[PDB]
Design a protein around this ligand. Sequence first.
Ligand SMILES: CN1C(=O)c2ccccc2[C@@H]1O
Ligand code: NA
Length: 330
Amino acid sequence: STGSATTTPIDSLDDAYITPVQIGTPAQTLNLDFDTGSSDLWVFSSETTASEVDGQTIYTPSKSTTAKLLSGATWSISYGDGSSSSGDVYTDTVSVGGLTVTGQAVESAKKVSSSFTEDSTIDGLLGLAFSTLNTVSPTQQKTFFDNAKASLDSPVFTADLGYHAPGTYNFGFIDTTAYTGSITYTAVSTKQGFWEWTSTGYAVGSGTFKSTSIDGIADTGTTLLYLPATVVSAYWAQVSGAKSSSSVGGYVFPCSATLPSFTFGVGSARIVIPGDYIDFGPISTGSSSCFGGIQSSAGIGINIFGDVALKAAFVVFNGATTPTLGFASK
Ligand SMILES: CN1C(=O)c2ccccc2[C@@H]1O
Ligand code: NA
């Protein structure tokens, strides 16, 4: 089997991407944030505290003929941005892009934090990291990918995120028309439950490539590119007037600037992030200070290749017995 679904930016900045997902029978279509940095499929639901729902589409387990309580199971998750959610668990049929899994754990939110409530465009998350991170207790559950894997034509999924445009998530096949050149594969460590890999270095604009190992995660659920402070300082030093602002919470730059590109290494290959991808626009409405898309990881504990980096590439998440990542230009 295979599946193929279009993923669409939630706003003009590409802050996140939503992908329609069919849950239940008859289908209830929710727009979920596919997150390769977490492992829970959770949704706004009829159980979600009413004051915490503001415009989201909800999943109603009772209105689904295939919805079965996973008795005793609870979940609770906290993300890198300080957001959180928790609740109970139903198994139900879940389809993505024509690919169906029966008996998928659908984690129904009883509570969500303010950042979820305030974003009407995201109806929940679909985690695509390794199932060792799933938060369901007392019986950990599998991700949609892990449940689909044995049925897929190839044990893979691909992320092809757009810059200010829709893109695609494919399951079970690598679409050889979607990228240019060849795909460079690189080793993955699953020790922390993430798609963790080591970049071979970076360049800023037209500058020389710096060969250096940067260990980080491929995380579709993180907007920005978070790298070591040395790397980030080297980038923003090439933008006149850029500075780190503790008041704003990262590097800002004059909205009048033209940003340099940023290159990262994948083995001997190179992915170039155009300068425009690194613009996240005014810090507040009408400001002439703009927020940077490359930020320091120093206050995180991990480097994160988020959407700023991933949307410059066609990315293969190879879930074979020994997982690997692949990157191609596009
Ligand atoms: C035991 N229960 C189920 O299996 C179920 C399914 C859908 C809604 C509600 C319920 C109920 O709580
Ligand atoms: Na921000």
